[PDB]
Design a protein around this ligand. Structure first.
Ligand SMILES: [Mn+2]
Ligand SMILES: [Mn+2]
Lengths: 546, 546
């Protein structure tokens, strides 16, 4: 019998007037930061080789090409990745104000401040209540004091709040929502973003008609080396994807569906997505709290993005991607360092997070997740009570309802997994050797190695469909060898293993051959079944992580 | 008319006496270094997770699990990987003495001292003239003074010489030859090796019959994490491989041939290899100087291994692998750092080294190397006069003889490559966008990126066989997409492109379709040929590295 607070704000959905510009379209072309290079207007900035050593050093420190970034104007003009039809929407002007919160940890100076500059440059002043920077316990000296003094440039409009300890990314956003009090909606941004022209009105309009709508710009790709901005490769013939997952809860994208397109009169208006990537979005501040906000249990990574997506949909709100609001996100390069925290197992902490989201929201579907990740069944996921009560109190709808009403396309791209027959290490019987992937993928060969009971590349599972899998991969027979190979798997591919626990036998089905090894050297292969050979006896043992 | 000095030593090949042990077989099993754990007798040493933070730290520093190595005795016993027949050879005792030289740079203390301990432990005292460690300009403090003082343990048998500048691996071995004066034969050893039992007599017997024979132990794999010792995966039913290369001059191994076995009375006696891996070998010391020794133009990491192999074979010597002489070599783990020198620009010096070797030794076969690596064609490879005069003065045989008489099996595993039609960047006509691999391999999809004219992943070559190649990979059509994929390539696979330079066109032969691009999307695909579309117009420009 708990409900969200009713719409009191009146607002009119925008109107498309083909051939007429405005009202939030800039009248004239955007002034460059520097006439007329470099990095403008998002032209690629190619450097080196006189720079290559400085570039690599900065990549190690930041994951981005900071000597390139450092010569691009903080106020640089950008390419326009939106469709033409976007320019002919007329919007109320009666929009709710916003606090954009930006969480950063050790972010480079020029990438942090260009995010800030971009938002100041391309957002109507009257709607920008504040830009709140949440320092999640950085140690780099340029972010302290230097930042304090510089920030005075905006007469208090930009404020920073330090964290005493490293709260990690999810809880730092929740801290953000508490420390950002001036605006009516919270707009979250990564600290390495550039916001496109007339990004605000499209993004905040739907929230203005209906406070329980949560909004997501289309997230474009800023090349972390050369800084030109590219849309993502998404399904739609127009580039529109909706956010999705597979049944290990890995983020996936699928194309905009014809069903959703029949719901929409226009090509460019908002559209329903089952989930959001996580870093960039807008909610009405009160609604976030009614939500609220992110489950406190969630540790440093990773979403969180699904938890908030499910709450919104299943507790009566909406999640909309807004084609006419676009934001570029810089994507990391290899070479970063760039390092996890020391925890045990920790669980891992992020795995523990998936279990929290699944156990409170997925109902019967937890089965598909424990099939994809049995190693996670017996994990100490922590206290879930208040989250379960919240869902009952607000009479939230079932994950079945959610899968069939708003996420109906997912299972056509990521089909439901078969139940497991058994999972764990594949150990040679009465020995200390384990089949182990070496992390090989997509055609490599699987080896023998000393058992370490740590799961990971020594963890397998076997399907009711006769699939021997690690992660999203399967093992099959690599012709012409007798070698066992790991490749990408599809629902009816490589259904070729059957395991006889009592027999200590894995037997390849198309041949008659058994699973075999040589203990020196560390070799795994199939050969003609022979009950004498102890090299064809295996046990499959659950590896529990505490 | 120049000749190598004649054999003056009289020595007789050993004799195989099935059922009778000795004479260099240890009489009684090897005393462990520590009764009875850990590391003995090369049992794998599995640690953590209480150690995992300290292990990862040491892998970063050294590339080996040094916490594990540090708890294994320097005098540990080891598993015996040689075949049984090996223990029944009877050797004359009339063998040459040896200086073993170990070149090291920043090696971990316990891996370095276990190499030495191992050599001291399993080598008959009377043949071991000295162990010369060559410090190639290390900075780590354990390696100096602590090293000088420890080394007194052996009363001057072991000695270290410091280099004033980092000479690199190849030139450090040459300094070794010069500072290691006592032994009749030089035995080179990596600073992370463990020599097997009775490694010495099998390895030095052939050189004692014949001073122009250069000898190579079978190099076994010491696991850098758990330290158990495994033989290499190698062709022969017995695990015997011979050393080879592809026509880019990458090291390769091929199974021992039936031709070589008809030449051999025994399963276990030495056999011919066309090349050595490079780190571990034995030559008579004068003979190496007569070869004189490693071309001095080779910079740090290069095909020295190939250069000494061709010299030995084409100038009248022999290179033999010795099944009864085995040495374990620790193989690096990911996570090391582990870093190249700053000298720009190029592949660079190492590619320059390939060119020196090829230009002096491969004769007409240089064409195959340049088809594999056209980017090297116009490289300033340096003065090669004296090397060419050496080959002429000593009347060395042709590379054509070598390929047809002693390396007769290579083209059956790595076929001669077709000539190139063209090579270079694949640039969009009158654009600054280039096809580029992103380093993707074996199934990945090639993309468009900003041209940088630095080669590498933006470099391609097209075959006279209609193959579009980067490295060892080829581009083909990824069903069901219209995307262009990169995969592993075989002589008659994916013969499916034709490049018209004047037409600026790349056309896919099976379909009719033209290579096409988006630019805005950074996308490379094939679509139906349309002459109006400039997105289907491409140039292939040589990229020159100076
Ligand atoms: Mn991010
Ligand atoms: Mn090495």
């Amino acid at each position: 019998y708990l409900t969200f607070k009713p719409q009191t704000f009146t607002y009119h959905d925008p109107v498309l007037r083909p051939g007429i510009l405005g009202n939030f379209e800039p009248k004239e072309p955007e002034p460059p930061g520097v006439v007329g290079g470099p990095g403008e207007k998002a032209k690629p900035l190619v450097l080196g080789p006189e720079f290559k050593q400085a570039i690599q050093a900065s990549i190690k420190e930041f994951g981005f090409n900071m000597v390139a970034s450092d010569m691009i104007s903080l106020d640089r003009s950008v390419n326009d990745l939106r469709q033409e039809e976007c320019k002919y929407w007329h919007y109320d002007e009666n929009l709710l104000t916003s606090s954009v919160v930006i969480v950063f940890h050790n972010e480079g100076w020029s990438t942090l401040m260009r995010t800030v500059h971009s938002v100041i440059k391309r957002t109507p002043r009257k709607y920008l209540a504040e830009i709140v920077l949440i320092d999640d316990f950085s140690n780099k000296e340029h972010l302290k004091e230097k930042l304090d003094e510089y920030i005075k440039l905006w007469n208090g409009l930009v404020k920073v709040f330090r964290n005493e300890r490293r709260e990690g990314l999810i809880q730092a956003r929740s801290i953000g929502a508490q420390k950002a009090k001036l605006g009516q909606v919270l707009i979250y941004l990564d600290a390495h973003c550039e916001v496109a022209v007339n990004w605000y009105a499209p993004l905040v309009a739907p929230i203005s008609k209906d406070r329980t709508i949560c909004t997501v710009p289309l997230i474009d790709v800023i090349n972390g080396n050369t800084y030109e901005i590219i849309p993502q490769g998404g399904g739609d013939e127009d580039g529109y994807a909706r956010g999705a997952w597979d049944w290990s809860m890995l983020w996936k994208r699928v194309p905009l569906t014809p069903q959703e397109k029949r719901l929409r009169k226009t090509k460019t208006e908002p559209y329903r997505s089952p989930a959001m990537a996580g870093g960039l979005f807008a909610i009405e501040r009160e609604f976030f709290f009614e939500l609220g906000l992110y489950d406190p249990g969630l540790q440093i990574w990773g979403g969180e993005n699904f938890e908030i997506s499910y709450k919104i949909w299943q507790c009566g709100g909406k999640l909309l991607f807004v084609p006419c609001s676009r934001v570029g996100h810089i994507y990391r390069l290899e070479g970063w360092q760039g390092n996890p925290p020391p925890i045990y197992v920790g669980s891992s902490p992020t795995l523990k997070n998936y279990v929290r989201v699944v156990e409170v929201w997925w109902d019967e579907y937890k089965d598909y997740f424990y099939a994809s990740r049995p190693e996670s069944q017996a994990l100490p996921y922590g206290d879930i009570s208040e989250l379960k009560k919240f869902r009952e109190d607000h009479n939230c709808k079932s994950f079945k309802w959610f899968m069939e009403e708003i996420a109906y396309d997912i299972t056509s791209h990521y089909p439901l997994p078969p139940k497991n027959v058994d999972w764990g290490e594949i150990r040679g019987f009465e020995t200390a050797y384990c089949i182990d992937s070496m992390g090989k993928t997509n055609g490599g060969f699987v080896e023998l190695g000393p058992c370490h009971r740590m799961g990971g590349n020594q963890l397998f599972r076997i399907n009711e469909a006769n699939q021997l899998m690690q992660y999203d991969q399967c093992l099959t027979k690599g012709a012409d060898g007798s070698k066992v190979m790991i490749t990408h798997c599809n629902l009816n591919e490589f259904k070729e293993w059957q395991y006889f626990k009592n027999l200590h036998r894995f037997t390849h089905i198309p041949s008659g051959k058994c699973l075999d090894r040589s203990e020196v050297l560390h070799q795994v292969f199939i050969s003609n079944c022979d009950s004498s050979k102890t090299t064809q006896k295996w046990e499959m043992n659950n590896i529990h992580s505490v």
